[PDB]
mmCIF file of C-alpha atoms in Angstrom:
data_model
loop_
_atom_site.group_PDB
_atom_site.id
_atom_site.type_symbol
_atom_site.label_atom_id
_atom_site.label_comp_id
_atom_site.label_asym_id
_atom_site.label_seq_id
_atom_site.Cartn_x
_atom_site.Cartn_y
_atom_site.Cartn_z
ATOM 1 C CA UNK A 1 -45.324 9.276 10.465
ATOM 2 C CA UNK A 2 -46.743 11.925 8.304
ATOM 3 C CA UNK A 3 -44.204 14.264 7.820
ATOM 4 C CA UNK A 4 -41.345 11.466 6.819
ATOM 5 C CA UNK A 5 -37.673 11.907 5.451
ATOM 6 C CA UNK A 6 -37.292 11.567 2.217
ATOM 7 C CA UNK A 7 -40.894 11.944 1.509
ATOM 8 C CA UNK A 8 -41.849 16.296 1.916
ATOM 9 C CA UNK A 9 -38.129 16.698 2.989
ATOM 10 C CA UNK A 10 -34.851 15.388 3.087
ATOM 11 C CA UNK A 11 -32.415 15.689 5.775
ATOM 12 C CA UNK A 12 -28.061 17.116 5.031
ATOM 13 C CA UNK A 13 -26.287 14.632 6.437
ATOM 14 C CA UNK A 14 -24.301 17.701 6.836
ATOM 15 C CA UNK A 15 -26.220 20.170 8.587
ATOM 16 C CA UNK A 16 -25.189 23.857 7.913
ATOM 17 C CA UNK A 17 -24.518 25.661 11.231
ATOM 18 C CA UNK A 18 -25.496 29.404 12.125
ATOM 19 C CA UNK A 19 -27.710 29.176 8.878
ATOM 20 C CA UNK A 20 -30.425 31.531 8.375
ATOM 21 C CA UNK A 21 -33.413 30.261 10.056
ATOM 22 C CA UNK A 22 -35.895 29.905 6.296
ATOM 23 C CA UNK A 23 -33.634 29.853 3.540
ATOM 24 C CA UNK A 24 -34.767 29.882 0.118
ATOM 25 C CA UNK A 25 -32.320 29.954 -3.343
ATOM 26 C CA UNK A 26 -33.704 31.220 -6.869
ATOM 27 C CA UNK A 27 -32.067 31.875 -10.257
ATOM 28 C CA UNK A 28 -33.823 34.568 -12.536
ATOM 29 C CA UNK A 29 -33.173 31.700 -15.115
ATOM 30 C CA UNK A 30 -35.426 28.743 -13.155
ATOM 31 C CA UNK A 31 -38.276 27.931 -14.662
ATOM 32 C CA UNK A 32 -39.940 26.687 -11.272
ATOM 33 C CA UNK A 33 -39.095 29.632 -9.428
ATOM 34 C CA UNK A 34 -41.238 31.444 -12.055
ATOM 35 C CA UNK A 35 -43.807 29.517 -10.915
ATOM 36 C CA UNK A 36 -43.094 30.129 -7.626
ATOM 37 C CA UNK A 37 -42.914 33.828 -7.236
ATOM 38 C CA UNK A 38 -45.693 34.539 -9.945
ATOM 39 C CA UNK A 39 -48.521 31.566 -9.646
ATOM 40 C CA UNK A 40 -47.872 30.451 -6.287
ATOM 41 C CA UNK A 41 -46.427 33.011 -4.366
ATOM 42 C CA UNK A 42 -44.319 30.422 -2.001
ATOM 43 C CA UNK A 43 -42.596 32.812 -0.040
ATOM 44 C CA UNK A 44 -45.520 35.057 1.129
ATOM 45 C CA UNK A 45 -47.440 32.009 2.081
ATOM 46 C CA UNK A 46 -44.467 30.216 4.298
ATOM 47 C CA UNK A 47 -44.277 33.813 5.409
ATOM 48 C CA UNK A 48 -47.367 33.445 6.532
ATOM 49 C CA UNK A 49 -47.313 30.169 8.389
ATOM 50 C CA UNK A 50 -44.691 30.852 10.156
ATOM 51 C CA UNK A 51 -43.677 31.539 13.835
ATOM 52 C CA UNK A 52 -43.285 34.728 15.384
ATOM 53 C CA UNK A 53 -39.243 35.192 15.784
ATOM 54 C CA UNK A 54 -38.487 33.639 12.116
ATOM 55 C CA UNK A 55 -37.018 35.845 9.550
ATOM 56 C CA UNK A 56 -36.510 34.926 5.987
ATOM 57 C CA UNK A 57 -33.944 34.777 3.482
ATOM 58 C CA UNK A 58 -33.682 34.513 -0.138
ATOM 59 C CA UNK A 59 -30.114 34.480 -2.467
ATOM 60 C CA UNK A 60 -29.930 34.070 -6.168
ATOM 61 C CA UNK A 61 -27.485 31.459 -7.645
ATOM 62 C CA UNK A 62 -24.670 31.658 -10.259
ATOM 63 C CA UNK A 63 -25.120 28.017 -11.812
ATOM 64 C CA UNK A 64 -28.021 29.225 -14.541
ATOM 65 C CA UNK A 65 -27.318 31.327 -17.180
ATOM 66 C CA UNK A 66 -23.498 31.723 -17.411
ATOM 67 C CA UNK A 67 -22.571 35.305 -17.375
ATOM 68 C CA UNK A 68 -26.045 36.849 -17.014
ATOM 69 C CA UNK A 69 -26.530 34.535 -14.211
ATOM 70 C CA UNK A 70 -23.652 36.183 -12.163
ATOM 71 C CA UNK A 71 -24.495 39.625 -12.980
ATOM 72 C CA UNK A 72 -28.301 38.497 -11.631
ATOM 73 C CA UNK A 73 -26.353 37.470 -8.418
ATOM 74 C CA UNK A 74 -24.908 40.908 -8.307
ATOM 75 C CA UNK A 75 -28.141 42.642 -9.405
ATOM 76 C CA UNK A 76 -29.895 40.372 -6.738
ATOM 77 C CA UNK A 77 -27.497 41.611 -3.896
ATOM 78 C CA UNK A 78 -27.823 45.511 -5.461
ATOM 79 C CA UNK A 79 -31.593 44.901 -4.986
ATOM 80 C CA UNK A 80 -31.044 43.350 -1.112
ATOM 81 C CA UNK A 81 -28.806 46.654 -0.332
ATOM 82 C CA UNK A 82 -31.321 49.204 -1.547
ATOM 83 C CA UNK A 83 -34.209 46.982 -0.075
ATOM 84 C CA UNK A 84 -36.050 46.955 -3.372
ATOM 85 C CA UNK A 85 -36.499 42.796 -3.971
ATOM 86 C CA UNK A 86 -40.359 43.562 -4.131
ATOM 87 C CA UNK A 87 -39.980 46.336 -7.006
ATOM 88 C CA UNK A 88 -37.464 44.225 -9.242
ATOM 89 C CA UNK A 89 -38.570 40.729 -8.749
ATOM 90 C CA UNK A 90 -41.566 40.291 -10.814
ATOM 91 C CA UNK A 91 -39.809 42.488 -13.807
ATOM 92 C CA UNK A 92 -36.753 40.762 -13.534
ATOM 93 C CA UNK A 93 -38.552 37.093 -14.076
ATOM 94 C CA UNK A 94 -40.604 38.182 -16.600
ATOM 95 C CA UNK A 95 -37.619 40.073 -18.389
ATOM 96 C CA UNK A 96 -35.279 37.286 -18.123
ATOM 97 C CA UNK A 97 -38.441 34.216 -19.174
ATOM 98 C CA UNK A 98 -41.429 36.098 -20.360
ATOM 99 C CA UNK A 99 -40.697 38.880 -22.933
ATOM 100 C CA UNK A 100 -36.678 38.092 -23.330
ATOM 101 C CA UNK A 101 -35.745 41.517 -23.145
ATOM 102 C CA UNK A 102 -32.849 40.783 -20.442
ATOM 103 C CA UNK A 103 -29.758 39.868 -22.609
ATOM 104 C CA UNK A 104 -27.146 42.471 -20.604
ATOM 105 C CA UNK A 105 -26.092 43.634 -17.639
ATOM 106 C CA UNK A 106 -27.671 47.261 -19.081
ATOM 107 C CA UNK A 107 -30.368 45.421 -19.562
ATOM 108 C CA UNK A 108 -30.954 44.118 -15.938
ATOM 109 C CA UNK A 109 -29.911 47.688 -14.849
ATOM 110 C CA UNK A 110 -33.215 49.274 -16.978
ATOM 111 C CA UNK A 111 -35.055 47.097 -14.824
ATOM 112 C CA UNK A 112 -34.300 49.022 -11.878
ATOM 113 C CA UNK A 113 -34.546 52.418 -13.579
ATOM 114 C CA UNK A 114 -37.846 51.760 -14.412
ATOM 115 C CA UNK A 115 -38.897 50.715 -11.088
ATOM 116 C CA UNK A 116 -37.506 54.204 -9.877
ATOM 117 C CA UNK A 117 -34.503 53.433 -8.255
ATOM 118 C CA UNK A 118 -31.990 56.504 -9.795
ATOM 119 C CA UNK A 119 -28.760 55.323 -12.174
ATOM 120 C CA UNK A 120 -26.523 56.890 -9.892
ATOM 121 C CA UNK A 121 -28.032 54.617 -6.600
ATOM 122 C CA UNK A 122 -27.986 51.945 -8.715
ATOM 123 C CA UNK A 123 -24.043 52.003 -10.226
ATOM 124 C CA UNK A 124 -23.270 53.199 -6.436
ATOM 125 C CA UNK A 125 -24.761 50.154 -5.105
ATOM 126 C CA UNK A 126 -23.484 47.532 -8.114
ATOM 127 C CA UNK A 127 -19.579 49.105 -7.543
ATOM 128 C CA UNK A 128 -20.072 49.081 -3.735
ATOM 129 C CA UNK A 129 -17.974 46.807 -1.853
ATOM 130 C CA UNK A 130 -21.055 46.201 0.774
ATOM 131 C CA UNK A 131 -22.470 44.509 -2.185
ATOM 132 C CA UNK A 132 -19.517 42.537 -3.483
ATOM 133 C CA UNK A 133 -19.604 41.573 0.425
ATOM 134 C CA UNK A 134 -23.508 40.043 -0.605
ATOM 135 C CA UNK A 135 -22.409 38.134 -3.383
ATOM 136 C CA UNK A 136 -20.288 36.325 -1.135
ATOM 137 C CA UNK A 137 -22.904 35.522 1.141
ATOM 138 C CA UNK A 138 -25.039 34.588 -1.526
ATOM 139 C CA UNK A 139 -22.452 32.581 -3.060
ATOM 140 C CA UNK A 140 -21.236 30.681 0.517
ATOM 141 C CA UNK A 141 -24.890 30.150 1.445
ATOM 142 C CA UNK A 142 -24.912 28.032 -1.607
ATOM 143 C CA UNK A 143 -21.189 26.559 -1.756
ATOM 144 C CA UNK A 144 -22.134 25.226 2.118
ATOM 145 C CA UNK A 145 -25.531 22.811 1.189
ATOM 146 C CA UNK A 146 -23.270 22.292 -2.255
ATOM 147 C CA UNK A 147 -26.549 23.381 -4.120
ATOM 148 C CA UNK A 148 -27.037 22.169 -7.763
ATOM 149 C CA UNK A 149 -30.888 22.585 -8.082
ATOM 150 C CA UNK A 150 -33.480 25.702 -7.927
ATOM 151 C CA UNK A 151 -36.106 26.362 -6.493
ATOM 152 C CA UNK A 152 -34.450 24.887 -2.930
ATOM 153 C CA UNK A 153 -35.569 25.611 0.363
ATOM 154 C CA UNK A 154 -33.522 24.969 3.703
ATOM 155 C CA UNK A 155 -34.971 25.199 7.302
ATOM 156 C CA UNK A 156 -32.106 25.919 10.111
ATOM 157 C CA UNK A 157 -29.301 24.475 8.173
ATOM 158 C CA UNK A 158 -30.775 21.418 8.630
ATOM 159 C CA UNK A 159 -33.436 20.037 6.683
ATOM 160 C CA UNK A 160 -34.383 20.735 2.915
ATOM 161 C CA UNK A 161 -37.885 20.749 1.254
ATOM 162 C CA UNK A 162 -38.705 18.293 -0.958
ATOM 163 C CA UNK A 163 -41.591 19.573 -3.195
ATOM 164 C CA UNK A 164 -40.958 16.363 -5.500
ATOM 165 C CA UNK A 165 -43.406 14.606 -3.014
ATOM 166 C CA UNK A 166 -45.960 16.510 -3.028
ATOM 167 C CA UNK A 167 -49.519 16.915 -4.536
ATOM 168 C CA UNK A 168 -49.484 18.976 -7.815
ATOM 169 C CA UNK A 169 -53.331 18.270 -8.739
ATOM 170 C CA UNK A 170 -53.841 21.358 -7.530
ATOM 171 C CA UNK A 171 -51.871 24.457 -7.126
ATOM 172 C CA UNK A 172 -53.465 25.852 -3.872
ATOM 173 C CA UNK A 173 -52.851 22.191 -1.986
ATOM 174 C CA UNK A 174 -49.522 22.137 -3.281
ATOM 175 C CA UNK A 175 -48.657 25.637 -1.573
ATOM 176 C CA UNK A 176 -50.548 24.790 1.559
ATOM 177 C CA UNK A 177 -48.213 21.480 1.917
ATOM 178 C CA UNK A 178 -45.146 23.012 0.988
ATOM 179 C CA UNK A 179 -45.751 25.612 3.690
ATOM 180 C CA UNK A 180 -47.595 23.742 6.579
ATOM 181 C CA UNK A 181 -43.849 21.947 5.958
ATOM 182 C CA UNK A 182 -41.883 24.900 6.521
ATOM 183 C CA UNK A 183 -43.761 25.292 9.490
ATOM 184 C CA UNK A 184 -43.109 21.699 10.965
ATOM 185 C CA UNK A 185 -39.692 21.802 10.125
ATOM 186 C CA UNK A 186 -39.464 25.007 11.822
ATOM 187 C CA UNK A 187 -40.959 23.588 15.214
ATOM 188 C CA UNK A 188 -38.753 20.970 14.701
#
């Protein structure tokens, strides 16, 4: 075939039931996923591929960074409550990669501030228990494909991309093929 197992994707032999539909993991910490959100823009252009009746997800992971990687989590679920992924995203990355100036929880919390979410929405949000409820979502999301590498992408539980066997050449192809994927997998 074209699309072939193994080759753009590999299939769980245990498939993950009542997953979301696109599920994508990222750690503030990934080098890739850099790449990803800032050169490539991955998500937007899967977004953009697919279906109508498709909604996407994307969780942060624990397994980079040690302690600032868990507080990310957190952060990442505070951002997911408010609805503010598209403000924090970008200065998160380059915070954490870029200038270095992410060494503290404080220090992911500034992020927000400065993107004009208030300190007292914030710490409201980061105490809550609707967002310890998020870690854990973000955490058994993970825990059930028994994830060990970022950037990862799952379609319905079932199937995971494989970017590995792709074309890098060029950065647009790469995209296209990662997404026209998505979008097979998806009528799969």
């Amino acid at each position: 075939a074209q699309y072939e197992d193994g080759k753009q994707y590999t299939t769980l032999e245990k498939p993950v039931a009542g997953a979301p539909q696109v599920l994508e993991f990222f750690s503030f910490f990934c080098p890739h996923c850099y790449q990803f959100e800032e050169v490539l823009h991955i998500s937007d252009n899967v977004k953009k591929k697919l279906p109508e009746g498709v909604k996407m997800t994307k969780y942060h992971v624990n397994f980079m960074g040690g302690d600032l990687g868990k507080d990310l989590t957190q952060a990442w679920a505070v951002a997911m409550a408010l609805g503010v992924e598209d403000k924090v995203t970008v200065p998160l990355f380059e915070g954490v990669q870029k200038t270095q100036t992410i060494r503290s929880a404080s220090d992911i919390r500034d992020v927000f501030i400065n993107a004009g979410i208030k300190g007292e929405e914030y710490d409201a949000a980061w105490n809550s228990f609707v967002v310890k409820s998020l870690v854990a979502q973000q955490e058994k999301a993970a825990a059930d494909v028994q994830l060990r590498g970022v950037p990862a992408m799952f379609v319905n539980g079932k199937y995971q991309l494989n970017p590995q066997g792709m074309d890098t050449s060029n950065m647009d192809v790469f995209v296209q093929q990662y997404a026209d994927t998505v979008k097979y997998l998806s009528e799969k």
